[PDB]
Amino acid sequence: GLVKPGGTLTLTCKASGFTLSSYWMCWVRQAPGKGLELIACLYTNGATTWYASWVNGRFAISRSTSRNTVDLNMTSLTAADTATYFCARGSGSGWSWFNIWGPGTLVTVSSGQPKAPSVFPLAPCCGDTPSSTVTLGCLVKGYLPEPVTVTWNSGTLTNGVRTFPSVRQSSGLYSLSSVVSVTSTCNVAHPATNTKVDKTV
Amino acid sequence: GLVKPGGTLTLTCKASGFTLSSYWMCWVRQAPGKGLELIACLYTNGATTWYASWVNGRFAISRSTSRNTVDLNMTSLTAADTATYFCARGSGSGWSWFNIWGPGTLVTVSSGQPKAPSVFPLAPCCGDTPSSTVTLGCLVKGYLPEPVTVTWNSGTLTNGVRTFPSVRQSSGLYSLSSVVSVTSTCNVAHPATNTKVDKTV
Amino acid sequence: SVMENYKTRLNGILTPIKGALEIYKNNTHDLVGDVRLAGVIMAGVAIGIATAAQITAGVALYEAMKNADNINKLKSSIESTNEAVVKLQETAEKTVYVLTALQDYINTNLVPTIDKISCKQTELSLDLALSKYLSDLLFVFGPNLQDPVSNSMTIQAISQAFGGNYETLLRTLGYATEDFDDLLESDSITGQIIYVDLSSYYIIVRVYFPILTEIQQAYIQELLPVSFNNDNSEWISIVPNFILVRNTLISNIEIGFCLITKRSVICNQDYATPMTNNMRECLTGSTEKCPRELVVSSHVP
Amino acid sequence: ALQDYINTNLVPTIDKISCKQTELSLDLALSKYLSDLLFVFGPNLQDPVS
Amino acid sequence: TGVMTQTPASVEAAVGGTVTIKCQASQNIISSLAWYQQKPGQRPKLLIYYASTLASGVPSRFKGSGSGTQFTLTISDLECADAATYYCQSYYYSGITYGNAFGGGTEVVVKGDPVAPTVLIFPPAADQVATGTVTIVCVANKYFPDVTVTWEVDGTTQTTGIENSKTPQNSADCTYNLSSTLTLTSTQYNSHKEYTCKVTQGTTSVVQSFSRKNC
Ligand SMILES: *[C@@H]1O[C@H](CO)[C@@H](O)[C@H](O)[C@H]1NC(C)=O
Ligand SMILES: *[C@@H]1O[C@H](CO)[C@@H](O)[C@H](O)[C@H]1NC(C)=O
Ligand SMILES: *[C@@H]1O[C@H](CO)[C@@H](O)[C@H](O)[C@H]1NC(C)=O
Ligand SMILES: *[C@@H]1O[C@H](CO)[C@@H](O)[C@H](O)[C@H]1NC(C)=O
Numbered sequence: 001g002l003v004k005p006g007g008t009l010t011l012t013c014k015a016s017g018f019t020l021s022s023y024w025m026c027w028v029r030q031a032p033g034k035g036l037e038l039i040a041c042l043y044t045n046g047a048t049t050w051y052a053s054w055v056n057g058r059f060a061i062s063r064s065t066s067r068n069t070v071d072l073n074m075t076s077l078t079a080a081d082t083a084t085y086f087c088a089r090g091s092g093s094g095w096s097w098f099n100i101w102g103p104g105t106l107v108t109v110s111s112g113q114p115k116a117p118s119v120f121p122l123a124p125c126c127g128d129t130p131s132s133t134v135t136l137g138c139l140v141k142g143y144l145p146e147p148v149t150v151t152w153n154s155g156t157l158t159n160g161v162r163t164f165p166s167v168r169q170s171s172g173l174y175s176l177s178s179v180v181s182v183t184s185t186c187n188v189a190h191p192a193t194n195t196k197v198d199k200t201v
Numbered sequence: 202g203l204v205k206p207g208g209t210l211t212l213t214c215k216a217s218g219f220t221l222s223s224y225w226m227c228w229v230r231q232a233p234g235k236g237l238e239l240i241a242c243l244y245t246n247g248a249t250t251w252y253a254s255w256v257n258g259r260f261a262i263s264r265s266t267s268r269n270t271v272d273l274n275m276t277s278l279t280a281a282d283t284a285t286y287f288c289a290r291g292s293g294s295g296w297s298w299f300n301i302w303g304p305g306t307l308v309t310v311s312s313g314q315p316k317a318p319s320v321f322p323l324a325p326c327c328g329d330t331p332s333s334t335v336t337l338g339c340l341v342k343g344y345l346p347e348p349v350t351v352t353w354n355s356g357t358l359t360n361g362v363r364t365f366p367s368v369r370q371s372s373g374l375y376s377l378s379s380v381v382s383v384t385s386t387c388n389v390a391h392p393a394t395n396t397k398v399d400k401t402v
Numbered sequence: 403s404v405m406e407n408y409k410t411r412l413n414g415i416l417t418p419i420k421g422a423l424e425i426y427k428n429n430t431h432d433l434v435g436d437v438r439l440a441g442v443i444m445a446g447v448a449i450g451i452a453t454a455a456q457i458t459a460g461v462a463l464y465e466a467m468k469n470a471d472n473i474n475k476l477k478s479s480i481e482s483t484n485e486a487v488v489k490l491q492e493t494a495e496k497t498v499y500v501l502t503a504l505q506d507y508i509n510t511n512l513v514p515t516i517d518k519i520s521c522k523q524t525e526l527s528l529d530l531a532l533s534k535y536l537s538d539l540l541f542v543f544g545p546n547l548q549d550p551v552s553n554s555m556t557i558q559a560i561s562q563a564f565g566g567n568y569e570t571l572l573r574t575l576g577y578a579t580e581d582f583d584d585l586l587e588s589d590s591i592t593g594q595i596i597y598v599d600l601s602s603y604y605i606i607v608r609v610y611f612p613i614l615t616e617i618q619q620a621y622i623q624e625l626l627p628v629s630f631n632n633d634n635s636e637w638i639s640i641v642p643n644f645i646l647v648r649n650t651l652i653s654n655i656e657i658g659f660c661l662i663t664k665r666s667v668i669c670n671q672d673y674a675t676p677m678t679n680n681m682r683e684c685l686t687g688s689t690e691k692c693p694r695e696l697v698v699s700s701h702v703p
Numbered sequence: 704a705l706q707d708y709i710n711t712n713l714v715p716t717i718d719k720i721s722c723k724q725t726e727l728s729l730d731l732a733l734s735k736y737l738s739d740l741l742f743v744f745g746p747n748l749q750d751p752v753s
Numbered sequence: 754t755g756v757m758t759q760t761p762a763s764v765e766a767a768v769g770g771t772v773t774i775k776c777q778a779s780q781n782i783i784s785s786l787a788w789y790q791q792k793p794g795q796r797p798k799l800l801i802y803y804a805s806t807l808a809s810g811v812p813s814r815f816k817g818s819g820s821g822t823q824f825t826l827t828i829s830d831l832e833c834a835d836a837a838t839y840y841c842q843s844y845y846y847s848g849i850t851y852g853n854a855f856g857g858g859t860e861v862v863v864k865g866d867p868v869a870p871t872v873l874i875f876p877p878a879a880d881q882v883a884t885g886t887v888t889i890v891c892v893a894n895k896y897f898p899d900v901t902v903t904w905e906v907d908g909t910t911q912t913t914g915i916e917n918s919k920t921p922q923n924s925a926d927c928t929y930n931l932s933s934t935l936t937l938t939s940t941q942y943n944s945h946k947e948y949t950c951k952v953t954q955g956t957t958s959v960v961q962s963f964s965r966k967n968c
Contacts, residue, residue: 127967
């Protein structure tokens, strides 16, 4: 997900439910909070390619044809290129609608380098009166790569889980918050910085 | 509907739910209280025509091909020609069953000329005891063209409407009767004579 | 990827035709019309070597170019057509008819069965259909077609691009005549390619539909050969079975290129050939001038 | 002639395609049959008494 | 080139009603149009292909129509779970003409039963006071329709330091959730005695307070 303005990145399809060579394959991109945009398809023969009008040779598709993978190459990246890049299979060998969408890979262009997340235990103090309904949770801030995973005590109780979407501060880093409710217990991992800390049950 | 024995009449299709040239089109006739009889079809090309064995050039089909109409021409009419003449579309371009039937045009050969209908207000007298259930209605007689329309106070209450079929007297004119029931109000129109009288509520 | 392979192959087939037509199109100039010149000029040095018929065909190609440009205004509509036969109208001027190859097969045999068979099966069937179309079309539009600048190719051969259904091609344009079959079988109805689009993979052909004209003061007499006996042997006169007489002038005729009907002999050109004076003297009445040949076959008239 | 095509290719697909599509396909089949039949039974057949 | 004019960008409709989305293609695409459903934080879900054919397992209330340049998408008997962004795409491939584009998208939001919010507030931890930066979060639970969020320390309103993110509509009752967080340095957190967070739903308004000591 980390990349420098003007750098290069290579992605891969994560569908893995079929033989990749026998299907129509596009790469779909979606800027955060924006509409879906189609980048580039790849015919089953493997030489003929379709490209949108705006790429103009900036992106390129190929397949490993041995490991059953499909790649996308990027150059001269800018802030507009920050998006989630979806590998979409398209129902048939030829041009068609997509019925299988890959999980997607987050991509972030930024002058900053990966920052380890700051985890805070937010909780109503012990001094206030405890009601029958209690609400607890964790808080994560101070991290630069967008993707976060918020699990809770290894996820054995997810009935009251309520994770919130991330938001940027003015300096470019993100912060989220998660709350729970149980009768009168938190692990957050950030893979890009490889931090998986969990304390203060 | 009015026509003289030996005269001529021209009818038109009133389907108007499609392009007339693209469908198989017959003219079906039905004498009052008699069976349906097929007169003549017209192919989509517009020159080839089908005719029953009995017409023998007495009837003829054509289409306006510009106003999207289909006509039927009649000559040497007799008392047997009195019928309702149905324009029937036939499901396809070629020979086929009919799934759309036109409303039909009443046709009456007779030496008589159009006669204005005689409208009577029949009603149980005011002298007799009024029960909770009351039955009211109108009566129409003395008219030569078959088609009658019986509406009631512009048709805002049609729950108890009970119009009866017409019948000929020996002299050749018709007469019908209509009754209603309401808790303790009539307009009859005859288009051929252009009479639309409504009184005695 | 079947359509891409087919496009590549069809471009390989079509490019030579386009270049051959462009040789005359590029070297034909329409000067501003006036009273001094009444036609267009052909660049003889640029053409280099050409027969008379080829130059006349280039003139015909120019005269076609006007309606060809009118038709090509509807190029976007031509690509969008999904029916075997379609009619194009825009201003009720020169209604353009479009025939599409294999479109009836796509619409009636592959799209209806797309549910019933696998996608790979359908793809293989489509590729097979395109390959068979190329195998049958190659005999007429392949390297065998050396001079595309010619209006001498019959419409039956031209119609191989439309599966050889020349009846649909001719009836769509609205041709109708008593001698329709006589013109067809005598190779008198011809077509000429006047435009090739390598990007859209379509072509425009100009159909030449003539009328038969009776050659005045001319007839064609036929002789029925019969074996005659002489010197205890059977013989057959080696004499023209078909003799052309025009203005009381006897000449041979190349009947093989003509259509023979019971009433007349129909030809797409004058197939008269000269006759040696001895043959003409024998037909004149000098029977010692006609040769004969021994009859050894058990079956002879 | 063409009866096998009517029975196996047009009547089975009458549900699947429009009536105009079926009519055009039928006309195309008849016209192709005429184009192929003309070479043998057209004016080329001069003497049918043979 | 090929472009897709999809209208409208967003639309509001009550539960049980019908909503109509429209997609316009610059060129004829001959019934080669698809419709997708996408919920926030999720991959798209195929709804309709070939303008009319419904994808397997898709409810019949989604109805597609159209041919050539104009196409429509109609959602009848609207449910809470239907709230999502809806896209259309052309996969036109005659063989010689290439037309591929995505619609701009339409955000649909379904009006559920109005429900008042339950406001909560959170105190900063001890490690939070370190480095001189502190986040106090105020959250609103199970609410509809949209609410305004305001903060007030010691009787003063603040325009900076606040960031709030709202969850997608709950698929059962169409209810939003909020997480408004406020940040300032530790010195100004210690100088002020109490902070209050006000949530406003039209005429209704909910407030929440907390001491400086303990919570
Ligand atoms: C992507 O492009 C860059 C520069 O052209 C090149 O160094 C890199 O190997 C490419 N990656 C792939 C997977 O083709
Ligand atoms: C019907 O026939 C009569 C007499 O032949 C003729 O006067 C009349 O114009 C015809 N009507 C139509 C519509 O052809
Ligand atoms: C004919 O002219 C066109 C346009 O100038 C050119 O593209 C083409 O190559 C020319 N063809 C020949 C055979 O000179
Ligand atoms: C293409 O498919 C659409 C929808 O199935 C249909 O309405 C149309 O008639 C079809 N066209 C052809 C040429 O098969």
